[PDB]
Amino acid sequence: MADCRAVCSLNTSDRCDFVKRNPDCHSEGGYLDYLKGIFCYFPPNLLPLAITLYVFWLLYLFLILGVTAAKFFCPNLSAISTSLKLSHNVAGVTFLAFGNGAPDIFSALVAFSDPRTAGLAIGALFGAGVLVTTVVAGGITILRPFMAASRPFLRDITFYMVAVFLTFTALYLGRITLVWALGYLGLYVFYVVTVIICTWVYQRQTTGQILLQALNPLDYRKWRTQSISCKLLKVAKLPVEFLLLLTVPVVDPDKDDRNWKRPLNCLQLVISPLVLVLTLQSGVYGIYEIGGLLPVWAVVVIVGTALASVTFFATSNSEPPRLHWLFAFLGFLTSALWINAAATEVVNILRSLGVVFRLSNTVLGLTLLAWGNSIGDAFSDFTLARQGYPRMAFSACFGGIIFNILVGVGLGCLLQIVRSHASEVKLEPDGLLVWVLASALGLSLVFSLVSVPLQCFQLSKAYGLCLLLFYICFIVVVLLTEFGVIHL
């Protein structure tokens, strides 16, 4: 049963057979098989084109992960929370971190669920932490210089150093047990409670018309105002948001009618359970059949139509019903499942590349997965800075990575422990590159901890340019370590 990275050590006429025979080149989840497409569908001379296509597909996957997280996931989370009298400023402080970190969390959950991929998770978390700490944070200060707040900055930097060293030592021990995962989650809860307490202490001291209007993702008057590049971005994003509108119900506590799109919501009482059934566990639970007569999706459709008609004729178009808030929960489920789905695909693609090019999980994680997971950070935070809120963006840039690392490691490892019934997740370090990654994260934190106070919390262009050059040097060292040029 040869390790199926040996596939390039074979004659091209045997490749497909190897892929079909070796269970090590089969995945546990997803819909497409990418090694099979590499070696069977495409002809051997057309290898580069295929891989080029794959990168494009991978990039498009990130786009989905961004949109779903920002327009459909966090709004419904906010609706659920604000149905329970929550505050305003910490809402902006922390929900920005949640929306920026959802892709990171779901990617870590997917990667930790398989020993062949767990390395990706670590590389993708630490890697993102480096990027956001240098390129995004520095970038903010180049776009608008501002004055940071001393106490929040020092609080965040301390908590994040603590989390980095906890993961550093868990990596040295080579494993992470149930108590460690529970400790990570508890430490995150402690951090949020501290934020709340300290803020308090600082302060004291026809219907078819609305179907069409509800399924239209364009605003033409705004669309003509934009530039050529933004128009191209919008036409790229059109199909994704059309599907998300079709399947995910959204509730805004802001708008007066709360997005009560009566007929679209009545249809989504049918559509959303189907996408949920066909998405959970890649649909394995879907073709499940009660008594060998009818599958799951049939009874789902029957009950869905019943409830959809019942609600359709029982409510008024201008007036939402009394159980309207429940839709947010539904919209929180289906959206999350969409994110999970896309995350699965991303991870599968990365695994495939590692087989074809014999690249480690750590390099793939800290480059491709990190950059893809941080695209949303860049959009959100640069846009927020250019609008006149660089202080909020800088706070998110250091308070969202804490969420990433703590919740990602804790929850991913906890779910793996529960599912596998084992007693720990094994973190085998992947050679010498993992220590380079950890050292780089520590050193970027040390640079910020010394520099920001010494400027008296007055951040400007020079700080950002220096952080950019730090990232360039870090990539130099990563490249050298991966080519075998530095060894021991």
Residues that bind a copy of itself (CB under 8 A): 139, 142-143, 432, 439, 443, 446-447, 450-451, 454-456, 460-466, 468-470, 472-473, 475-477, 479-480, 483-488
Q: Which is nearer to Ca ion, 377 or 424 (CB)?
A: 377
- Are the CB atoms for 447 and 439 separated by under 8 Å? no
Residue 212 binding target from Ca ion, a copy of itself, none, CB below 5 to 8 Å by type: none
Pick the closer one to Ca ion by CB: 70 or 301: 70
- Under the binding rule (CB under 5 A), the answer on residue 133 touching Ca ion is no
CA distance 426 to 424: 6
107, 369 contact by CB (below 8 A)? yes
The nearer residue to a copy of itself, 86 or 486, going by C-beta atoms, is: 486
Binds 100, which of Ca ion, a copy of itself, none (CB < 5 to 8 A, cut-off by type)? Ca ion
Burial (0-12, 13-18, 19+ Cβ within 10 Å), 201? exposed
Whichever of 308 and 467 has its CB closer to Ca ion, that residue is 467
Please report how close the Cβ of residue 211 comes to Ca ion at its closest, in angstroms.
34
User: Minimum distance between the CB of residue 325 and a copy of itself, rounded to whole angstroms?
Assistant: 35
Exposure string of 296-321, with b = 16+ CB inside 10 Å and e = fewer, is: bbeebeeebeeebeeeeeebeeeebe
Would you state the structure tokens that stand for residue 308, as one six-digit string? 């959809």
State the binding partner of 188 from Ca ion, a copy of itself, none, CB within 5 to 8 A by kind: none
CB of 449 to a copy of itself, least distance (A): 11
Q: Shortest approach of Ca ion to residue 450 CB, angstroms?
A: 19
Which entry of Ca ion, a copy of itself, none binds 377, CB below 5 to 8 A by partner kind? Ca ion
The least CB distance from residue 346 to Ca ion, in Å, is: 13
Which of Ca ion, a copy of itself, none sits in contact with 466, Cβ below 5 to 8 A by type? a copy of itself
246: closest CA among 328, 305, 331? 331
Binding-site partner at residue 373 among Ca ion, a copy of itself, none, CB < 5 to 8 Å by type:
Ca ion
- Choosing among Ca ion, a copy of itself, none, which partner's interface includes residue 422 (Cβ < 5 to 8 Å by kind)? none
At closest approach, how far in Å is the CB of 39 from Ca ion? 31
The least CB distance from residue 56 to a copy of itself, in Å, is 19
* Binding mask of the shown chain, residues 370 to 399, with x at each position contacting Ca ion by CB under 5 A: ---x---x----------------------
State the minimum distance, in angstroms, from the CB of residue 237 to a copy of itself: 21
Q: Which of residues 78, 94, 100, 367 is near Ca ion by CB under 5 A?
A: 100
Task: List residues near Ca ion by CB under 5 A.
Answer: 100, 104, 373, 377
